[PDB]
Amino acid sequence: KLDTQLVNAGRSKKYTLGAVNSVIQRASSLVFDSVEAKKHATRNRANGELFYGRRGTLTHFSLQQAMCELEGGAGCVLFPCGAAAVANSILAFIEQGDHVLMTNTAYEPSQDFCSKILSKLGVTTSWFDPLIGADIVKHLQPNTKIVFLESPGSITMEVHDVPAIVAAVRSVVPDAIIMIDNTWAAGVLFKALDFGIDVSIQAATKYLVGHSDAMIGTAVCNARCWEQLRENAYLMGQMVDADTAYITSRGLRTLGVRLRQHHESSLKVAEWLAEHPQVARVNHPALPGSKGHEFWKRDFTGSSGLFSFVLKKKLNNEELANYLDNFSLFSMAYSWGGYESLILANQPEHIAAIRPQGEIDFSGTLIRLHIGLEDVDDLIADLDAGFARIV
Amino acid sequence: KLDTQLVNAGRSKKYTLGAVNSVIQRASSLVFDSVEAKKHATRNRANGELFYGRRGTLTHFSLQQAMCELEGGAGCVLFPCGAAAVANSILAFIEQGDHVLMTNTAYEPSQDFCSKILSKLGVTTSWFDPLIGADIVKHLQPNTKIVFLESPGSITMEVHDVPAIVAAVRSVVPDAIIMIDNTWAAGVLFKALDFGIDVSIQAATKYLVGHSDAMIGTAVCNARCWEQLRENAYLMGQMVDADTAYITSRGLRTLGVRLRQHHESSLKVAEWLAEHPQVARVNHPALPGSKGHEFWKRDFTGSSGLFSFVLKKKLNNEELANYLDNFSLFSMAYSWGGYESLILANQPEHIAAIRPQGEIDFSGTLIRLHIGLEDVDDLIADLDAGFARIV
Amino acid sequence: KKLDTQLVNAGRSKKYTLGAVNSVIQRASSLVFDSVEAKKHATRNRANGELFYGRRGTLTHFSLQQAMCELEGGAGCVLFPCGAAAVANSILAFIEQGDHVLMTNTAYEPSQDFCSKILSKLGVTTSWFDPLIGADIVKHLQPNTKIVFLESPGSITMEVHDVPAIVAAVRSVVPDAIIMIDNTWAAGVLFKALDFGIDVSIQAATKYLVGHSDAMIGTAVCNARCWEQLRENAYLMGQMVDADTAYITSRGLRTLGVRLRQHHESSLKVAEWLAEHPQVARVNHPALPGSKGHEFWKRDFTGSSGLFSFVLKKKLNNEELANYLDNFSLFSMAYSWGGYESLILANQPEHIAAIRPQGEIDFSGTLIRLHIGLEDVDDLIADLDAGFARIV
Amino acid sequence: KKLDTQLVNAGRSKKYTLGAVNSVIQRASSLVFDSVEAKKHATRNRANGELFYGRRGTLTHFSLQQAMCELEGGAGCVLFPCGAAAVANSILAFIEQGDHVLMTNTAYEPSQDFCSKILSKLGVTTSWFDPLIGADIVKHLQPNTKIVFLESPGSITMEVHDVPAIVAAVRSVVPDAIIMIDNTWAAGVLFKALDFGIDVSIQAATKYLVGHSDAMIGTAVCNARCWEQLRENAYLMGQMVDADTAYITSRGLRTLGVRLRQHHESSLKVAEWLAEHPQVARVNHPALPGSKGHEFWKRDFTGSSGLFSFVLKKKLNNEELANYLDNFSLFSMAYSWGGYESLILANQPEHIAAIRPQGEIDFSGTLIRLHIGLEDVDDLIADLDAGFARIV
Ligand SMILES: Cc1ncc(COP(=O)(O)O)c(C/N=C(\C=C\OCCN)C(=O)O)c1O
Ligand SMILES: Cc1ncc(COP(=O)(O)O)c(C/N=C(\C=C\OCCN)C(=O)O)c1O
C-alpha cells in the first residue's frame, strides 16, 4: 500500500478544492473576516489554521500532512534546504554546556556546523564510528543532549545498527534527543520513528523533489519533540516557499516508481563493479560484504540509487581529468536523488579530513555515483569506457 | 536616478540572456564540464560562479547584485523570510559570553529570538529606548557585540537618531557590529550603510515583493562584515528559492512608483486623522510632532505607507468587534507593504508587554494602518465610517 | 469607487483568495466531481464559473475573468495565449464563408496578415479604411460586412479614431455588424470601448496589464449580445491561458493605476521636448495637440499611456541608423511595450507604406517608436539628446 | 541509446540548461537585440531557434521542441495551449474552402465537433470511417480529400487501426493527402507515427507527457514536408504555450519510461482480472487478446499505457449508476487521464452511439473507462470488486 499512500497523502479537498494537486496559496498576509475569526486563528496558529505566511498556507499544510502520514510523525517542520533542517533541528534542543555526539560519517557541513557554530556557543561535539553499535555508551556523557545519526553515511555509505544504538542511549541518557539524517532512504525505505528515533531529517532536495530543481528540508518529529522543534525553528524564521512545498508534494507521487528503478539499476551496476578488475571495493548497502549490509538487510525495505566504489589505484591529476572529463552519461555535479546520473571523485586524504576521531581504510580514489533513470546498460557501457581510459 | 537604478539593477545579459528579466534557473545540482571547471567553480563558489544550489543560481546572483547596488553594500545574503534574516544575522556574530543591545521597539519576534534562544546559549540581551541618542553609552558593556536598531520602530514608529547612536557606539565599542532592520524604508528611503551601519536587514517580504505573496529576507553588508555573515549563514543552510528571488527582483522595478503613492496617501490620511475628534495621537514619521520626526526629516528621503494612531478611548471587546469587523476597504491581516490596505488594533497592555525596560505612554487603543494603492479618498471615507461606528 | 480602488479589489472575492490577498493558483486539467449529482451540476454550469475542466478554467481564471468584466464593464471575458490569438480567434468566431471584414489600415500588422492570409482562403474578404474616415466609413460598408475592426490609437503611427462617429455611421447602415476594437494602448481602462457601443474590446494583456514584459495573454471582454458565441467558438478552437499567467495578470492590475499615471506624465514631457527639437519633423502622441485625432482623444479618453512615435526631419541611411540605435544606454531595442523599461524601434517610410493598405502615409523621414517606461524622465531625455547628436 | 537514456537527456544541451540539470525557465515577451546586426540576424532566424520574440518562443520552448523532435523523430514540433488546440489548429493549417476531411468515427469528440461546427461554415466537408476499415478506406476517399485523421486507439472504445494498411491505401489514391494522427494514448513513444508514413503526430501532452494532471499543452511533431506550413499558419493564429508549461513537460519526459511500464503492467493485470469477471461483458484493452485491433497493437506498438474500458453485462439505471460511482475510494471521477491517480468514467450505449458517426456500436451494457494510475494494483482491484458488489 505504499504506492497508494504516496499517491494520496495530503490530498484532502480542503487543500485541493476540486483539483488533483493542492492549490498554490502564495501569501504573507492572511485576512481575518472578524475579530472573532482573528482570535480563533491566533489560538490555532500552530494547528493548521490560516494565520500568517511564516507559519504557512494551505499548500504547506498539505505537504506537512503528507510527510506525517508517510513517516508516522506527530508533526513536520519545513526548512529552506536539508542543511538548514540539520543545523536548526540541532539548535532547537541545545543549550550552553550541552554535548552533541555525532557519527563521523555525517555530511560534512553538518560536522562544520557543530565545530564552527556550536563551539562558540559553549556546546561541545565529539564523534563516533558508524559501526560502534551498543558500545556507543563509551561516548555518552551526563550532559549528552543530542545523538546524531546518518545511515547510510555520506560518501562511504556505512549503515548503523540503529536498534542497538538506540537501546544503549535510552539506558544511559533517556532524555537525549536522537536524530537521524534519513535522506538516502527518502524517509520511506527506513522508518526512523518506528525505531525509537525522535526526529527524522531529510534534504527533501534529493529524492522527494526528484528532479534537481528545488531545495527544501523536512523534520518529522515524534510527539515528544515536535513542539520545541516547531516553535524554536519558528523563532529562527525557518520556512519554505509555497511553490517548493507544492513541488515537493508533487515529487512524492512518483516516489515509488522512481525508487524501484534506482534500486534495480544501482544494484546491477554495483554487482558489475564488484567483479571488475580495477575496482578494489564497492560500498553499496544492498551489496553483500558492504559495511553494515546486515543491518540494511534487516532494517530497510529497499535501496535508493546513491553509492560509491574505491579504485585499486589512486589517480593522479592527469588520470583524474582524463577519467572524469570524458564521460558521456554521468555528469559531474553535487547533490543527487534526481533522474540524471552523477559522478564525483574523492581522494583518500579528502575523506580522512572529514572523518573526525576515526580512521580511513582505503588507499585508492573513491568514486561516488548516483544512478539515475537512464538505461542501466548504457550507464555500464559508459563506466567500462571510463575504466579503459585509466587502464 | 533612483527610478533608473531600480529598473536596471542586476539586469546584466549574463542573467537575462536576452530577456528583460533574469532567467529562472531552478537547481540543486550544477554540472561541471571538467575537473578544471570544477576546481575553478570551487575556488569561486562564493564569488558568483555556479557551484551548488545552496550557494545560488544565476537568478540569485542577479538579485544579490541588485541589492548591493541599491543599498551600496559589499555583498547580500538571502534568507527564507525577514525573521530568518534577523535571527541568523545576529547568530553569525555572537559567541557565548557576548551581550546584545537591542531597541525596545524591535519587532516582537526579534526580541523573542534574543530572550528565548540566545539566552540558553550564554548570550545576554538588554534593551534601550529608541530616542536615547548619544546616551546609549550608558547601556554599552565591554562585551557588547551587537547593537540592533529598528527605525521607525515596529507598531509605535519612533525614529532613532542613527548618527548620534553610531558615534557613541564607535567611541566606546569600536568592534561592535551595528545592525538595523531597515524594512519600513525598503532599504532605499534610508541608506543605512551610509550612516556607518554594518548590516542593513529587510523583510523583503514587505515593499520589495510588494504584493503579499512571497517571503524573503535580505542582509546587505559592508566589506567588514560580509564574509562572516555569508559563511555562517551558509553553515545554517540559509538560502531562498530561485522563484522568490526572481519575484523579488521583479518587485524592485515598480518600487519607486509604489512608494511615492504610499507616501502621498499615508501622509494625507495621517493629517486627516491628526485633526479628527476621536484621535489622541498620530504616529507617522513624516508627520510633525511624531517621535523622532526631526530625524526622519533630516535622514530619510521619503516615507512608505505604514503608521499607527491612538484613539482617545480604549475600546472594549464589543466596540472592537463593531469597529474592526465592518470595514469595507481595510483588511485585518498581518504583514504589510502590499497593494491592499490593512488594519490591526493593539491594546495598551499588549504593547506594554513588548516594550522591555521601557514604559508605554498612551492609554487608548492603538490602530496600525498600512495604506495601500486604493483611492485615498475611499480609504478616508471608510475610516470616517469606522469612527461613526464607535461614536 | 474610483479606478484605483477598483483596480486593487477587482476579482478578489474570498471564494478565489481563500483567506489570502491574491487569488489562489489552482493548476489543473482534471477537476474532480464528488458524485454523479455534483458532476451533473458542474456540466450544466461548465460555462458559468463552476469547476468542470481545466480547458474551461479553474478558480484562478474565474478571478481574472471577473476582474476584467468589472473593469471594462462587459458581460463576459474570454482568455487567449496572447494578444494575436485574441484578435485572430475573436474574428474567426463570428465569420462564415462569404462575409466581409472591414478593418482599419493602421491595425497591428499581424492582425492584417491574419485577414489576408488565413481569412482569404476560407472565402472571407477584407478591405481597409483610413483611421480618420469618421462618419464617411459608410462608403466602405457592404451588405455582407460582418465585422468592423477598430484600433485606436493605431499601431506605430498613433492616429485616434472618432469612434462615436464611426459607431453611429455603421449602426445606421448595418445594425447587426459586430464592431470590435484592439484597445491595448488604453489598457481597456483609459477608453471604455463597451460604453461607446463597441461589441468586443480586445487587449494584448501582454502589454500594460502584465506590465513587466514577462507573460503573454490576450483578453476579449464582450457585451451580452456577443458573449456566448465568442466564448463557445473560441472554446472549440481550444483557446485558453495557463493559471499562472492568469494570476500574474490579475496581479498586474493592482499597480496599473500608479504605473499608467507615470507613463502618461513621463511620455508627455518627452513628447513636448521632442516637438520643440530641431531634428524632429513631427511627434505622433495622442495627448499632444496637432497630433492626428487629438481632439477625439481629449474628448473620449481619460488618460494616456507611454507609447508614441515621432518622425525625424531626415530619412536615415544604414550607417546612420546603426550609429543612432546601437549607442543608446537607457532605451533597449525590442518588440512589444507596456512594461517598466523604455524601448525604441525605428521604421523607414517604405516599411510603413508597405503596411498601410488602401492608404497613403503622410511622412518621409525615419519614424521612431518609443515606449516610455518608469525610468527618470530627465535621464531618458538625456539619452535621446545624445542620440540626436550622433545623427548631426 | 535506448528509450530511457533518450528520455533522460532529450533537449538538455548546455545552451538551454546553462550549467543546471533542467533547462532554464526564460519568461518573456520582449527579447532584446544588442544591435541592428543582431536584430537582423534574429529576424532571419526567427523560426530556427534564435531568440526573436516570445510568441515564437524562448530558450525553454526550444529545449522542449528539440526533445519532442528527437523522441518522435520529426523535423519540427509545434506547441499549443492544450490538446484540443493542437487538433483544431493542425487541421485548420492545411484546409481551404472546398476541401474534404476524412476522420475516424472513434475520434475524440471535440475533434469531431470542431469539424462539424467550425469547419462546416468555412466550406469544408467531413465524413467518417470505421477504425477497422483498413485498406477499404479507399471507398471513402474523394478527389478533394485533403486530410485523413487517425486516432489509434480510439477514444473511449479503444479500437486499434491497421495503420500500415490505411496509409498504403490512401497513398495509392491520394499521394498528397496530409495524414494526421492523435497519438496521445501511446504518448508518441509507444507507436512511432512518423515511421509509418504519417505526416503529423499530435498529442495532448496534457496526459502522459505532463503525467501529473496539472498542466495543459498540445504538441504536433511534423515531417519535413509539413513543418513550415503547420508552423507558420499556427503562428498566424497566435498559437503558443507558456515557458513554465514547456519546462514542466520537458520535466515530465524524464520519468515517462518508468511511469509507462507501471501503467502497462498494472492496467494489464486489471484487464485480465476484469475479463474473467462474471459481471463484465467485454474488456476493451489493446494489449488484451480478442480486443479490437489487438494483433495490430501487438505488431505495431512497443508497449501499452494505462487507459482502457470495459462493458458491464448490464445497462445500469440511474440509482445503480450513482450507487456504483459514488462509493469508490481509490478511483476518482474526473475527465482526462495520464496522471498518477486512477480515474473512472461511465458511458451509456446511447451516449457512445450518439458520437459514432456513420457507424454502429457493438455493445448494449454500460461502458466504464478506467485510467490505471500508480497506486498498488491489488488495492485498485479491491476497490473495483467492491463496486461490483454494489451492483449485484
Ligand atoms: C545526506 C545529506 N543530508 C543533508 C544534505 C544537505 O541538503 P541541502 O542543503 O543541499 O538541501 C545533503 C546534500 N548533499 C550534497 C550536496 C553538496 O553540495 C555541495 C556543497 N556542500 C551532496 O553532494 O552530497 C546530503 O547529502
Ligand atoms: C520590521 C519587520 N521586520 C521583520 C519582520 C519579519 O519578516 P517575515 O519573517 O514575516 O518576512 C517583520 C514582519 N512583520 C509582521 C508580520 C507579522 O506576522 C504575524 C506573526 N508574527 C507584521 O505584521 O508587522 C517586520 O514588520
Ligand SMILES: Cc1ncc(COP(=O)(O)O)c(C/N=C(\C=C\OCCN)C(=O)O)c1O
Ligand atoms: C496593439 C497590439 N495588439 C496586439 C498585439 C499582439 O499581442 P501579443 O501577441 O504580442 O500578445 C500587439 C503586439 N505588438 C508588438 C509585438 C510584436 O513583435 C512580434 C512581431 N509582430 C509590438 O512590437 O508592437 C500590439 O501592439
Ligand SMILES: Cc1ncc(COP(=O)(O)O)c(C/N=C(\C=C\OCCN)C(=O)O)c1O
Ligand atoms: C485522445 C485525446 N486527444 C485530445 C484531447 C484533448 O486534450 P486537452 O485539450 O484536454 O489537452 C483529449 C482530452 N480528453 C479528455 C478530457 C476532456 O474533458 C473535457 C470534455 N471533453 C478525456 O476525458 O478523455 C484526449 O483524450
